[PDB]
Amino acid sequence: MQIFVKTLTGKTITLEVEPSDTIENVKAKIQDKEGIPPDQQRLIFAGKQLEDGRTLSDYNIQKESTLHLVLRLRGG
């Protein structure tokens, strides 16, 4: 199924995924397209940050669902 990912520059990229793909698998697919290593990535869907170990099906992510890619600004 084809989903959309909003990149760091606000561009929409398409990703071909399966409901059984884990969040880790989706991060690997984003690395393949954007070059961003998975440990930098945070993925947001409908306001929720997606958790490692879960699948797209766990979040009811389907064709045309949009995931938003964000990184981190660390502060203490």
Partner 1 sequence: AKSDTGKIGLINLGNTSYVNSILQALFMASDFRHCVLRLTENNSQPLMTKLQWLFGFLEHSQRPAISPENFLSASWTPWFSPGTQQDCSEYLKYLLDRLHEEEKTGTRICQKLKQSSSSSTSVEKMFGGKIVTRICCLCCLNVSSREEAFTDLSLAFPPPSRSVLDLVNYFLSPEKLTAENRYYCESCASLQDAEKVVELSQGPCYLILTLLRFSFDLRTMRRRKILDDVSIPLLLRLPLAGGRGQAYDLCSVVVHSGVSSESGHYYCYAREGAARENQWYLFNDTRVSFSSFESVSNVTSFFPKDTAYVLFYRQRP
Site for partner 1 in 11-50 (CB under 8 A): 11-14, 34-37, 40, 42, 44-49
Q: Least distance (Å) from partner 1 to the CB of residue 61?
A: 11
Residue 5 exposed, middle or buried by CB count within 10 Å (0-12, 13-18, 19+): buried
With CB under 8 A as the contact rule, the residue among 18, 19, 20, 70 that binds partner 1 is: 70
We find the least distance from the C-beta atom of residue 25 to partner 1, in angstroms, to be 18
How far is the first Cα of the chain from the last one, in angstroms, to the nearest whole number? 40
Residue 57: partners with Cβ closer than 8 Å, 6 or more residues away: 19, 20
Binding site for partner 1 (CB under 8 A): 2, 4, 6-14, 34-37, 40, 42, 44-49, 52, 63-66, 68, 70-76
